[PDB]
């Protein structure tokens, strides 16, 4: 019949137990520190790490010199150092199990623009990114969860159309300007 | 193309209204001959052989068995000038509610009174249905009336001429006080069963010369009904105003679902947009438009059309509801409204607490008088005294009306056909008037 795809998967897992005072504060620490909207996206990155930990753990139980362990071993190590959460010289499967979620959270675009100084605050960063102001390479990106790679980290900058790089100021500046010239000769 | 109008045939009890219009349909070519030939065999089978012409419109099994018209019958034929729609009314005392539905959704009316000895003297009486039929026609937005003297062959001598002259003056002496004009209305001799002078001049009527009517828009002269039917004035059609549609009837047709049938009086109805019903507050899109089993693209005012709705059950919408476009202002329920009415006849008095039955836009429900706000004179709306106490016959009064049942009406100042209504009790019309102010819900 139809030529659809219906290939979808959930990107997060809810906690087994609700209402732990320890877990609620730990997630709220991260949400406030990294300026996140809700607990789904701290659960999402946690789910991402768990999938990486599960894949890394499976390879570790796999016998050494196994082609699959060798091929997929450097495959996941290659992309972990590409995004930047893993040190260039820390290229061992053991060191992956030591990864946390803070490093996976600071690679976010909202965090990097704040750290780059383009934004005055982590929460300024989210609204700045969402308002189509920042760009990576020559592409404007309006998603805070855009993880950046080591190569793309330097290119992060203001978009040309935004009232921070090129000209063309915002409407409120124009309306204020036209009101000023309309109030006098 | 052809203008769109409506004619209702009304008269006394057992006056042959359905027989006369059945004979008219046959002459004009509405249906063929063999089917009528098949009705006479069936009619002769049960026993009533004189009711064959009326078997065309009296389709109901109980109507034929009991020999009495009970329900409205819609039928189609074509004149030589435009498109004409006819309805059939019971004309009985018990079914007074049923003629009210049809006459509200009726442009022109045709009153017929039998000329036979005994049938006429029963027609003119306190119990006579002809007298309140004319008043109900007047109060339900019918401005054009044709009077027809039926069954001259029954009376003795056949074709007396003087008897025809007498009966028409008797009805004319009643329309004078009703408000109609004898000059504007048309008078014609017809035969329900004999079958004379419908399409061609009758060779048996040398005494008849020709009727004439004078109106502000011109003159007209003729001999049979069709001359009057083609010389009537087409009414105004306020198409620019928001659409309203009272629920005449609802049917469930296999394969297309629910179909509400009713007359359009304002606006234009098409397939495509969404409509809202006031008393039940259901919002649905119109599926299709058909009248007389013929498809349409638009529904001009004055069209008795049957539109199709989707995702609506039969019991959800019932007869008497008003359907309007949701994009324009849709009708709501009215917990109260302010209406002026005169009093026709009442042996007793009116006080706070009396519950008559109000009939408007094919809706018939009993309503209370919350309070008597003010009594005014018979005409021109001139204030006279304050502090109403009791109401009698022959006087007007404003009043606030709070019906318990859900209901929807529109002010006469905006919608003429919707503001026209009747108030009845004791199987007599006791009040006639229009609604000036309404309260939305």
């Amino acid at each position: 019949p139809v030529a659809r795809s219906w290939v979808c998967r959930k990107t997060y897992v809810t906690p087994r137990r609700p209402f732990e005072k320890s877990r609620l504060d730990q997630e709220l620490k991260l949400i406030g520190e990294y300026g996140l909207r809700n607990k789904r996206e701290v659960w999402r990155v946690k789910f991402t790490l768990a999938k990486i930990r599960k894949a890394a753990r499976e390879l570790l139980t796999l016998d050494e010199k196994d082609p699959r362990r060798l091929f997929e071993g450097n495959a996941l190590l290659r992309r972990l150092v590409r995004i930047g959460v893993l040190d260039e010289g820390k290229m061992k499967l053991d060191y992956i199990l030591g990864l946390k979620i803070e490093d996976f959270l600071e690679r976010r675009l909202q965090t990097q623009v704040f750290k780059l100084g383009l934004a005055k605050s982590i929460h300024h960063a989210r609204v700045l990114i969402r308002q189509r102001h920042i760009r990576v390479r020559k592409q404007v990106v309006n998603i805070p969860s855009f993880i950046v790679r080591l190569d793309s980290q330097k290119h992060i900058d203001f978009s040309l159309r935004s009232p921070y790089g090129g000209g063309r100021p915002g409407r409120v500046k124009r309306k204020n300007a036209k009101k000023g010239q309309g109030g006098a000769g | 193309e052809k203008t769109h109008i409506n004619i209702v045939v009304i008269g006394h009890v057992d006056s042959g209204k359905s027989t006369t219009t059945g004979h008219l349909i046959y002459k004009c070519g509405g249906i063929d001959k063999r089917t009528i030939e098949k009705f006479e065999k069936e009619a002769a089978e049960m026993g009533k052989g004189s009711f064959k012409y009326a078997w065309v419109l009296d389709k109901l099994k109980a109507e034929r068995e009991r020999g009495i018209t009970i329900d409205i019958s819609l039928w189609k034929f074509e004149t030589s000038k435009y498109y004409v729609t006819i309805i059939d009314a019971p004309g009985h005392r018990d079914f007074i509610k049923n003629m009210i539905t049809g006459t509200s959704q009726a442009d022109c009316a045709v009153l017929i009174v039998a000329a036979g000895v005994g049938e006429f003297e029963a027609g003119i009486s306190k119990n006579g249905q002809t007298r309140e039929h004319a008043l109900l026609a007047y109060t339900l937005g019918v401005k054009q009336l044709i009077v027809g003297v039926n069954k001259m062959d029954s009376t003795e001598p056949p074709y007396s001429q003087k008897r025809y002259e007498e009966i028409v003056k008797e009805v004319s002496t009643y329309i004078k006080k009703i408000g109609y004009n004898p000059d504007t209305v048309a008078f014609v001799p017809i035969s329900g069963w004999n079958g004379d002078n419908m399409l061609e001049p009758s060779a048996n009527m040398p005494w008849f010369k020709g009727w004439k009517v004078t109106r502000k828009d011109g003159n007209a002269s003729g001999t049979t009904l069709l001359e009057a039917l083609d010389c009537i004035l087409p009414p105004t059609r306020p198409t620019d105003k928001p659409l309203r549609l009272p629920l005449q009837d609802v049917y469930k047709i296999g394969g297309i679902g629910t179909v509400p049938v009713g007359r359009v009086e304002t606006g234009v109805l098409k397939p495509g947009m969404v409509v809202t019903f006031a008393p039940v507050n259901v919002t649905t899109e119109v599926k299709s438009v058909e009248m007389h089993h013929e498809a349409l693209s638009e529904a001009l005012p004055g069209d008795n059309v049957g539109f199709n709705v989707k995702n609506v059950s039969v019991k959800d919408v019932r007869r008497g509801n008003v359907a309007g476009d949701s994009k324009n202002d849709p009708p709501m329920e009215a917990a109260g409204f302010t209406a002026q009415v005169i009093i026709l006849n009442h042996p007793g008095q009116i006080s706070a607490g009396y519950a008559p039955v109000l009939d408007c836009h094919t809706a018939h429900i009993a309503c209370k008088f919350a309070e008597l706000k003010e009594k005014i004179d018979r005409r021109s709306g001139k204030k006279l005294e304050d502090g109403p106490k009791f109401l009698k016959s022959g006087d007007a009064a404003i009043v606030d009306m709070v019906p318990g049942k859900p209901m929807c009406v529109e002010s006469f100042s905006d919608y003429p056909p919707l503001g026209r209504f009747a108030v009845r009790d004791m199987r007599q019309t006791v009040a006639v008037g229009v609604i000036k102010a309404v309260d939305k819900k």
Binding site: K138, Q139, V140, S159, L160, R168 | -
Partner: protein
């Protein structure tokens, strides 16, 4: 007009249809997706051809403006263009007309010709009265 440049890539000639195929990317820095007519006339100037045989379609604007990628069709002759081209593009440029009736009526006409057998007068007269 001041800052609108046309670049081509994946260019290849195929005399299979006597045409040369390419995918073009426009650069409208602060402008809306440039209309196909302007691309047609500029792409013609780049390839030295009259701007009535150039065919372009499939123009998708990237997120944030600037680059828009489209597909380019050029031909050696307008004769060949009428020969092997989809009819919508010919209708888009006005060289082909589809002044027809809706498919629903065509099916009804066909079914109604199925009811009448043989007689050409009624077979061609099946759709006259039920207009």
């Amino acid at each position: 007009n001041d800052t609108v440049t046309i670049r081509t890539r994946k260019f290849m000639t195929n005399r299979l249809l006597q045409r040369k195929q390419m995918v073009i990317d426009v650069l409208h820095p602060g402008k809306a997706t440039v209309p196909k007519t302007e691309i047609r006339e500029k792409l013609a100037k780049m390839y030295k051809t009259t701007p009535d045989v150039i065919f372009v379609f499939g123009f998708r604007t990237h997120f944030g403006g600037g680059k828009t990628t489209g597909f380019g069709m050029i031909y050696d002759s307008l004769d060949y263009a009428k020969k092997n081209e989809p009819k919508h593009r010919l209708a888009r440029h006005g060289l082909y007309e589809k002044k027809k009736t809706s498919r629903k009526q065509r099916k009804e006409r066909k079914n109604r010709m199925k009811k009448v057998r043989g007689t050409a007068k009624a077979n061609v007269g099946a759709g006259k009265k039920p207009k």
